[PDB]
């Protein structure tokens with residue numbers, strides 16, 4: 107879980 | 117790479 | 127939309 | 137099948 | 147004569163087609179959560195109603211360009227300034243303060259350096275403007291956000307906190323909305339005791355009344371507790387008449403199968419003169435689910451006679467009752483949200499469409515949540531798995547396969 | 558001296574680490590929705606408490622096999638039978654009725670044919686049993702579902718309707734839970750008018766109080782309206798003291814940037830003697846977001862001084878306040894649900910992590926919902942898009958690319 111948005115690797 | 121078949125986790 | 131569950135084709 | 141490239145909708 | 151088995155699709159569309167939309171009432175805006183607007187809402191003022199600074203800094207003439215400027219005063223939040231900025235002058239401004247006459251841009255304090263203040267250090271006198279402002283920079287003109295006469299919310303809007311804030315913004319403190327349904331719930335059965343009771347021989351506690359009332363309350367609708375009614379037609383008719391008087395919707399559970407003292411369908415038809423639209427549904431669970439309407443003096447009452455088995459009662463309440471209540475309170479598309487999830491376990495398919503409470507969980511960088519059928523003990527069900535009927539093709543579904551899940555819980 | 562820019566990750570973990578869990582209270586079970594159990598709950602009775610029929614039909618001796626049987630009476634719901642079934646005999650049973658002594662299986666009425674009834678047609682006398690029952694068939698033995706002494710709900714369970722039903726089932730009508738936070742909300746600014754007011758020169762209506770109170774109420778917490786406070790330290794201190802007295806949590810908005818009459822951080826630190834854990838956050842929107850704790854007589858008060866800009870106020874309320882309130886009311890993992898969605902539009906990334914209200918929509922047989930940033934007008938925001946900070950690699954995201962969305966609405 108992270109409160110900062112992430113990029114999707116799939 | 118592996119010569120033995122693997123299961124897919126996605 | 128359908129109230130009866132469906133199978134996934136992808 | 138098409139010889140002209142297509143965009144992906146999924 | 148048993149009622150015909152109604153398909154799940156026909157039973158569902160019958161409930162939505164036959165359910166009425168309630169009338170309207172005026173409410174205070176602060177009571178608007180979950181309500182649907184029955185009127186368009188218009189702004190009677192501009193937002194902002196004066197030209198407003200975007201920044202803490204200085205109101206300048208852009209044409210003056212960069213350089214050393216006399217500070218003629220301050221525009222503070224809540225005060226209309228009296229002074230006019232002339233070429234060579236600026237006025238201090240804070241975010242949201244009005245732009246004085248003669249200024250056409252704001253320079254943020256970070257693009258300035260203070261030269262001279264008062265000996266008290268209380269007033270700024272001269273500032274160096276380090277940038278060339280574009281005319282209009284860091285100003286919200288009058289009506290930038292909302293124009294006087296603009297429709298800010300349309301009829302049919304299902305309101306949440308941001309819509310309540312917008313009503314506050316425009317000063318529309320009273321709004322026309324659809325009424326919420328009042329929902330009366332009764333349990334049936336000579337075997338039932340209240341939750342507060344110690345057991346007696348042959349008896350069990352009534353759970354369905356609690357579970358159904360809580361399900362309806364969770365959605366924000368007012369409820370009426372009609373208690374436990376015995377397995378006899380006179381008492382059932384009296385209790386239905388009380389429900390019809392006090393509520394828009396009556397929910398019963400039990401007494402709808404073909405057992406000797408299952409009496410509800412006879413009472414609804416013969417004694418109450420309601421129209422039973424379906425009395426059996428080809429679904430698992432929920433075979434004896436019954437839906438009726440009763441038209442009195444141009445008011446349509448809604449009656450759901452749910453199955454007695456507690457799992458059946460809560461599943462059918464989620465499939466049929468909640469969407470009906472959403473249509474009654476004015477929601478334009480009252481259907482539930484259906485998402486795709488991955489099955490956590492293999493499942494054998496039934497010839498009937500099958501439904502089961504589950505918990506949806508999103509895992510790290512996986513696009514689809516997993517559906518786990520009822521630390522997972524610490525979470526309430528938030529989904530109803532919707533399994534397809536078995537066919538010659540599909541007899542079973544496997545772990546990881548993609549299924550439909552109806553949202554019944556906040557995720 | 559401006560406060561240091563705190564990373565979004567550090568600010569979030571600081572709020573959850575520093576927020577207390579409230580104490581416990583006993584409530585009536587019917588008030589349990591959204592509450593967290595602070596005790597394990599045990600069954601004091603078996604469910605079922607007698608051996609119970611699964612079906613409408615007949616209680617038989619399996620060893621008798623199929624054939625023609627004397628019906629010695631009926632076991633009806635709610636009555637303990639008095640008769641013993643002897644070889645060659647059966648008793649009529651309904652679903653949920655007790656199994657008489659001497660019977661060890663139930664045959665459902667569909668696996669029977671009636672031969673002889675009374676001339677009145679009121680009593681069945683002889684039935685043909687068409688099947689070989691397996692011993693135990695269509696009976697729920699005593700304690701099948703719940704055993705006396707079994708823990709049915711663990712401490713830490715976040716209760717919904719099915720948990721309320723289970724408490725009714727076991728007759729545990731009073732339960733220990735965590736308290737809910739009482740949340741006081743004030744707005745700040747010399748420019749603000751009440752929603753009920755007509756505009757005056759230089760002024761606007763207060764929207765944040767309405768939007769923040771509605772956000773908190775939506776989550777089921779009690780609130781206190783502390784009104785509008787002017788931009789002056791004495792009034793702000795008086796209003797904070799009132800919040801501290803009446804509430805567990807104080808939310809302010811406005812007055813937290815570096816403007817001349819932005820006073821909240823000075824009052825919290827110098828006048829109220831609270832510990833400011835962060836006063837700026839590297840996030841968009843929400844740069845001046847401020848979190849403080851105040852320890853009085855072994856009670857920790859929580860203070861969130863949110864930014865004045867209305868969009869900033871509601872976004873930061875959803876990111877920081879709601880998770881804090883979930884920890885205070887006892888939820889073990891109070892973090893919000895994060896799902897994956899597809900962007901409906903290209904977006905330029907900021908160096909700060911960026912957040913924007915959106916509507917999540919699931920399309921036909923598409924695994925991922927689409928996120929559309931704020932007929933879509935008829936739906937309230939149910940997501941907060943969580944955009945990643947720009948890097949040398951990623952400067953922009955495109956339509957269809959997969960993003961994190963925090964659930965803030967029922968889907």
Ligand SMILES: Nc1ncnc2c1ncn2[C@@H]1O[C@H](COP(=O)(O)OP(=O)(O)O)[C@@H](O)[C@H]1O
Nearest residue numbers: 241242744763764765811812813814864865866
């Ligand atoms: N309660 C509120 N409702 C609507 N707008 C508000 C409210 N409080 C502040 N604002 C506006 O938000 C902007 C920022 O206000 P300010 O008090 O300077 O916030 P901060 O200093 O925390 O950034 C100004 O335009 C102000 O008028």
Ligand SMILES: Nc1ncnc2c1ncn2[C@@H]1O[C@H](COP(=O)(O)OP(=O)(O)O)[C@@H](O)[C@H]1O
Nearest residue numbers: 333352353354400401402403453454455652653
């Ligand atoms: N309110 C209730 N709470 C708990 N169990 C119930 C309740 N109402 C009925 N049941 C049980 O559900 C089963 C089915 O009850 P019944 O009245 O025969 O339902 P139906 O005829 O609609 O199938 C029985 O075991 C009965 O004791």
Ligand SMILES: *C1=CC(=O)N(CCOCCOCCN2C(=O)C=C(*)C2=O)C1=O
Nearest residue numbers: 114115116124125126509510511512513
């Ligand atoms: C899909 C993307 C993703 O990150 N997960 C979680 C598991 O990550 C393991 C895979 O990382 C990249 C390689 N990969 C797979 O193993 C499966 C697809 C794929 O790209 C997802 O489930």
Ligand SMILES: *C1=CC(=O)N(CCOCCOCCN2C(=O)C=C(*)C2=O)C1=O
Nearest residue numbers: 134135136144145146920921922923924
């Ligand atoms: C994924 C499955 C699915 O049905 N949809 C909706 C659009 O359906 C169009 C595609 O049907 C099958 C062929 N196909 C694609 O076009 C893309 C993947 C794929 O299998 C989905 O989005």
Ligand SMILES: [Mg+2]
Nearest residue numbers: 334335400401
């Ligand atoms: Mg019954």
Ligand SMILES: [Mg+2]
Nearest residue numbers: 401403405408
């Ligand atoms: Mg029955």
Ligand SMILES: [Mg+2]
Nearest residue numbers: 745746811812
């Ligand atoms: Mg202010």
Ligand SMILES: [Mg+2]
Nearest residue numbers: 812814816819
């Ligand atoms: Mg400010």
Ligand code: NA
Nearest residue numbers: 432453455458
């Ligand atoms: Na049933």
Ligand code: NA
Nearest residue numbers: 843864866869
């Ligand atoms: Na801000």
